[PDB]
Amino acid sequence: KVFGRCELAAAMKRHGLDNYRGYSLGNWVCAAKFESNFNTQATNRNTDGSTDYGILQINSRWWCNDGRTPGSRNLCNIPCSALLSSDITASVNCAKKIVSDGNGMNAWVAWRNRCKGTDVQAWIRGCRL
């Protein structure tokens, strides 16, 4: 599924991301825009051993199981396929695990390099959630 900006913002709000661990909603919408272009089936297979899955491009090295890499971990305790669903709930649950693990939204490269420090509130402009 390819989401629109406000459509995804609504779903993320429903799943409780607005202000989660200090990150107002626009942070999460901006991260998804640059990570996946809002596409739930985005998948990128990297030379560094990461396969990144779904709307938040979550990494198989640590967070989900796809079977391919026996030295990896599965800390969200999910198949990576769960991150490719049309509903965002597994992606949001695993994102929440990543951030609350003594960490932040620095876990998304595109957040650090495209969203941090910007007017992230504007990703919810015209959404009237």
What are the residue numbers of the active site?
35, 52
Which contacts of 122-125 are long-range, i.e. CB under 8 A and separated by 24 or more positions?
122/26, 123/5, 123/9, 123/25, 123/26, 123/29, 123/30, 123/33, 124/6, 124/9, 124/25, 124/26, 124/29
The answer to whether 119 is a known ligand-binding residue is: no
| Ranges within 16-75 binding Na ion (CB under 5 A) | 60, 65, 72, 74
Residue 93's binding partner out of Na ion, Cl ion, none, with CB under 5 to 8 Å set by partner kind: none
What CA–CA distance (Å, rounded) separates 10 from 93?
16
Residue 5's binding partner out of Cl ion, Na ion, none, with CB under 5 to 8 Å set by partner kind: Cl ion
User: In the complex, what is the shortest distance from the CB of residue 94 to Na ion, in angstroms, rounded to a whole number?
Assistant: 12
Does 57 participate in binding Cl ion (rule CB under 5 A)?
Answer: no
Residue of 36, 40, 59, 91 that binds Cl ion (CB under 5 A): 59
Among 29, 55, 16, CA closest to 114: 29
User: In the complex, what is the shortest distance from the CB of residue 76 to Na ion, in angstroms, rounded to a whole number?
Assistant: 9
- DSSP H helices, the chain, are 5-14, 25-36, 89-100, 109-110
Positions in the binding site for Cl ion (CB under 5 A): 5, 21-22, 59, 62, 65, 67, 69
Positions in the binding site for Na ion (CB under 5 A): 60, 65, 72, 74
